[PDB]
Design an enzyme around this catalytic site. Structure first.
Site, PDB file in Angstrom:
ATOM      1  N   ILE A  12       0.827  -1.198   0.000  1.00  0.00           N
ATOM      2  CA  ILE A  12       0.000   0.000   0.000  1.00  0.00           C
ATOM      3  C   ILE A  12       0.867   1.257   0.000  1.00  0.00           C
ATOM      4  O   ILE A  12       0.697   2.126  -0.848  1.00  0.00           O
ATOM      5  CB  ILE A  12      -0.959   0.008   1.202  1.00  0.00           C
ATOM      6  CG1 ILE A  12      -2.022  -1.083   1.019  1.00  0.00           C
ATOM      7  CG2 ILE A  12      -1.616   1.369   1.357  1.00  0.00           C
ATOM      8  CD1 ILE A  12      -2.860  -1.359   2.263  1.00  0.00           C
ATOM      9  N   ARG A  15       7.257  -0.114   5.638  1.00  0.00           N
ATOM     10  CA  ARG A  15       6.356  -0.571   4.584  1.00  0.00           C
ATOM     11  C   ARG A  15       5.023  -1.109   5.118  1.00  0.00           C
ATOM     12  O   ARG A  15       4.985  -1.868   6.088  1.00  0.00           O
ATOM     13  CB  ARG A  15       7.038  -1.630   3.725  1.00  0.00           C
ATOM     14  CG  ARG A  15       6.230  -2.029   2.513  1.00  0.00           C
ATOM     15  CD  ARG A  15       7.058  -2.854   1.547  1.00  0.00           C
ATOM     16  NE  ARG A  15       7.553  -4.085   2.156  1.00  0.00           N
ATOM     17  CZ  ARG A  15       8.090  -5.085   1.469  1.00  0.00           C
ATOM     18  NH1 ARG A  15       8.192  -4.997   0.149  1.00  0.00           N
ATOM     19  NH2 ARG A  15       8.518  -6.173   2.095  1.00  0.00           N
ATOM     20  N   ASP A 127      -1.232  11.686  16.819  1.00  0.00           N
ATOM     21  CA  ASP A 127      -1.399  12.987  16.180  1.00  0.00           C
ATOM     22  C   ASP A 127      -2.624  13.032  15.278  1.00  0.00           C
ATOM     23  O   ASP A 127      -2.849  12.144  14.450  1.00  0.00           O
ATOM     24  CB  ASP A 127      -0.150  13.387  15.395  1.00  0.00           C
ATOM     25  CG  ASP A 127       0.665  14.446  16.108  1.00  0.00           C
ATOM     26  OD1 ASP A 127       0.367  14.728  17.291  1.00  0.00           O
ATOM     27  OD2 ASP A 127       1.598  14.999  15.489  1.00  0.00           O
TER      28      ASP A 127
HETATM   29  C1  LIG Z   1      -3.442   2.506  11.912  1.00  0.00           C
HETATM   30  O1  LIG Z   1      -2.550   3.194  11.092  1.00  0.00           O
HETATM   31  C2  LIG Z   1      -2.238   2.681   9.833  1.00  0.00           C
HETATM   32  C3  LIG Z   1      -3.271   2.340   8.945  1.00  0.00           C
HETATM   33  C4  LIG Z   1      -2.953   1.856   7.669  1.00  0.00           C
HETATM   34  C5  LIG Z   1      -3.946   1.515   6.756  1.00  0.00           C
HETATM   35  N1  LIG Z   1      -3.921   2.084   5.545  1.00  0.00           N
HETATM   36  C6  LIG Z   1      -4.832   1.791   4.608  1.00  0.00           C
HETATM   37  C7  LIG Z   1      -4.780   2.460   3.389  1.00  0.00           C
HETATM   38  C8  LIG Z   1      -5.595   2.077   2.309  1.00  0.00           C
HETATM   39  C9  LIG Z   1      -5.526   2.800   1.106  1.00  0.00           C
HETATM   40  O2  LIG Z   1      -6.330   2.461   0.014  1.00  0.00           O
HETATM   41  C10 LIG Z   1      -7.108   1.300   0.035  1.00  0.00           C
HETATM   42  C11 LIG Z   1      -4.649   3.888   0.990  1.00  0.00           C
HETATM   43  O3  LIG Z   1      -4.591   4.632  -0.188  1.00  0.00           O
HETATM   44  C12 LIG Z   1      -5.202   5.898  -0.179  1.00  0.00           C
HETATM   45  C13 LIG Z   1      -3.843   4.281   2.065  1.00  0.00           C
HETATM   46  O4  LIG Z   1      -2.975   5.374   1.894  1.00  0.00           O
HETATM   47  C14 LIG Z   1      -2.127   5.799   2.928  1.00  0.00           C
HETATM   48  C15 LIG Z   1      -3.916   3.567   3.269  1.00  0.00           C
HETATM   49  C16 LIG Z   1      -5.833   0.858   4.898  1.00  0.00           C
HETATM   50  N2  LIG Z   1      -5.851   0.267   6.103  1.00  0.00           N
HETATM   51  C17 LIG Z   1      -4.932   0.560   7.038  1.00  0.00           C
HETATM   52  N3  LIG Z   1      -4.984  -0.092   8.329  1.00  0.00           N
HETATM   53  C18 LIG Z   1      -1.609   1.730   7.288  1.00  0.00           C
HETATM   54  C19 LIG Z   1      -0.578   2.073   8.174  1.00  0.00           C
HETATM   55  C20 LIG Z   1      -0.895   2.551   9.452  1.00  0.00           C
HETATM   56  C21 LIG Z   1       0.229   2.930  10.421  1.00  0.00           C
HETATM   57  O5  LIG Z   1      -0.018   3.303  11.518  1.00  0.00           O
HETATM   58  O6  LIG Z   1       1.563   2.813  10.013  1.00  0.00           O
END
Ligand SMILES: COc1cc(-c2nc(-c3cc(OC)c(OC)c(OC)c3)cnc2N)ccc1C(=O)O
Ligand SMILES: [Cl-]
Ligand SMILES: [Cl-]
Ligand SMILES: [Cl-]
Ligand SMILES: [Cl-]
Length: 246
Positions: A12, A15, A127
């Site tokens: 996504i 990583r 944050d």
């Molecule tokens: C809890 O914090 C996090 C959540 C996620 C996370 N990211 C996505 C996600 C899905 C997308 O499209 C389907 C995205 O594209 C716009 C996207 O862009 C950043 C993110 C979906 N579910 C999730 N749980 C990822 C990382 C963290 C973190 O805290 O590092």
């Protein structure tokens, strides 16, 4: 509780990866942390932080399911809920690109659900920025946990407190409406100047005076004039359908 239990579908961001649990096919994501370059002290801090994530169970906070250690690659995987709607940053960028303001109903959902997320964080005592707020497939809003950047949401007092969180929420909601933050500048010193004056444009006229009123109260210069979590949720704007639904 091993990496082999899961299949990576694809990356996504960098990583963070969308994955599928083999046993039942459940879609999840994991975040990769290479601890190979950490000291024992830093790894201990990592362990305690991860154990505290595991405790947070709330419909408006991203759910953390599991932690996986692969000693071979010195990688720790934090397995969490998948939020198919992505983050609020992308939503705001999309709004700008297509020259289309977001529905007031959507803004009320974010206000309601993030306020509840904050209420839970405060009780347990993250944050508040668009990149750290996620949308699932059912209109639900979840608070997550991710120098060069401009600190757009820094409160007056924090630049000199649970009410500081209300200021930050105010900035986030303002940006959802206006598609820009209430205070902008090219340098931090300029930004700080604007923040201390506490002046900003009204959110766009398509939004109700009631919504403008509450966001404006959250952006009061005095922390004690900002509404509490309880006072926000008492607002006549906020209704059952703005809350989470499974
Ligand atoms: C809890 O914090 C996090 C959540 C996620 C996370 N990211 C996505 C996600 C899905 C997308 O499209 C389907 C995205 O594209 C716009 C996207 O862009 C950043 C993110 C979906 N579910 C999730 N749980 C990822 C990382 C963290 C973190 O805290 O590092
Ligand atoms: Cl526009
Ligand atoms: Cl609207
Ligand atoms: Cl305007
Ligand atoms: Cl939910």
């Amino acid at each position: 509780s091993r990496a082999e239990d899961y299949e990576v579908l694809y990356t996504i961001g960098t990583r963070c990866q969308k994955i599928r649990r083999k046993s039942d096919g459940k879609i999840l994501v994991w975040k990769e942390l290479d601890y190979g370059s950490m000291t024992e002290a830093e790894k201990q801090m990592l362990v305690s932080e991860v154990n505290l994530l595991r405790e947070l169970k709330h419909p408006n906070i991203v759910r953390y399911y599991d932690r996986i250690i692969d000693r071979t690659n010195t990688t720790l995987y934090i397995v969490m809920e998948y939020c198919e709607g992505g983050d609020l940053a992308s939503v705001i960028t999309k709004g700008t690109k297509e020259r289309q303001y977001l529905d007031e109903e959507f803004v009320l959902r974010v206000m309601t659900q993030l306020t509840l997320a904050l209420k839970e964080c405060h009780r347990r005592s993250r944050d508040l920025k668009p990149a750290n707020v996620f949308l699932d497939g059912k209109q639900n809003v979840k608070l997550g946990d991710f120098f060069v950047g401009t600190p757009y949401y820094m409160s007056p007092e924090q630049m000199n407190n649970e009410k500081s969180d209300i200021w930050s929420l105010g900035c986030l909601l303002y940006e959802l409406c206006a598609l820009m933050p209430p205070f902008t500048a090219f340098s931090q010193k300029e930004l700080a100047g604007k923040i201390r004056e506490g002046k900003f444009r009204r959110i766009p006229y398509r939004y109700s005076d009631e919504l403008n009123e509450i966001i404006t109260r959250m952006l009061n210069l005095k922390d004690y004039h900002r509404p509490s979590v309880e006072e926000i949720l008492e607002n006549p704007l906020i209704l059952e359908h703005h809350h989470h639904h499974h």
